[model samples]
Target: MGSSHHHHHHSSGLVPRGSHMSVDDIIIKCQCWVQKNDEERLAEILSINTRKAPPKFYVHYVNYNKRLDEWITTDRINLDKEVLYPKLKATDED
Candidate 1:
């Protein structure tokens, strides 16, 4: 109650349930790490595969292109990054 986080897992943490944050938001809102080749690439989850025993999230890389978008297993996902936005420069004339 005093501290911030608690690692409490009755079942598998990969198992999707509407807990603190709903599964609906996890796909679009959260940008987690995904292992590709031999490196951990920064990716945003677009969709998820539920039929598989171990669920996989459809991840699109940050610096990379949408052509590389694919399903990465839960084992490779690491949630340790932040958010996104836009910016504009000063006008030419007043």
Candidate 2:
């Protein structure tokens, strides 16, 4: 098993699930870092290849726990924005 956050993950940090936020919301919030014409948040959402099952409240917390580990490793920058954004949007011109 992965290391568990002793505190409930949802209340433990930023990017908490169902904080009335989606991945799209996060990307949009990061807009100032990228081109004005680009849709960065949607790009990240599209590229992640995540297949989420219907989750209970705590399940979201669990996933966020693992994700937060990755975030902290990158000092909490959404690195997926830089790595996955361009490829996601490249074929999505519509």
Candidate 3:
């Protein structure tokens, strides 16, 4: 019997291609769709690409907290004032 060696590890290999979409890129794409009111284009960009995004997008960033080892799940944060579309909602509902 000797010294024990047990430790956790985070595999860098797990990171997916385009896993890191720059904030600028997202903003640009989002603005373009919002400006033109292109629901189709907006959905394409904002949505997590299962085949490309890998794992997940919304859950990985907005919900998951690796440091905390927990997921802060809530619609409140997801529907922040800045991103909320009150006008869109009103028209859609009415």
Best by TM-score: 1
Residue 80 lDDT (model 1): 42
Question: Candidate 1, residues 18-94: lDDT per residue as tens digits?
Answer: 22322344656467765554565577887887778556678777777778888876656644432122323444575
Model 1: residues >4 Å from true position, as ranges? 1-25, 35-40, 80-94
Give the winner by TM-score: 1 or 3: 1
lDDT of each: 0.58, 0.26, 0.27
User: Each candidate: how many clashes?
Assistant: 0, 0, 0
Q: Ten residues in a row with the worst lDDT in model 3?
A: 71-80
Give the top-scoring candidate (lDDT): 1
* Candidate 2 structure quality by residue, lDDT tens digits, 3-86: 533332222233333323234433322322222223532111212222342111111122244452221111122333432111
The order of the candidates by TM-score, greatest first, is: 1, 2, 3
Measured on C-alpha atoms, candidate 3 has an lDDT of: 0.27
Worst 10 residues of 2 by lDDT: 53-62
Candidate 2: regions farther than 4 A off: 1-15, 24-46, 52-94
Clashing pairs in 2: none
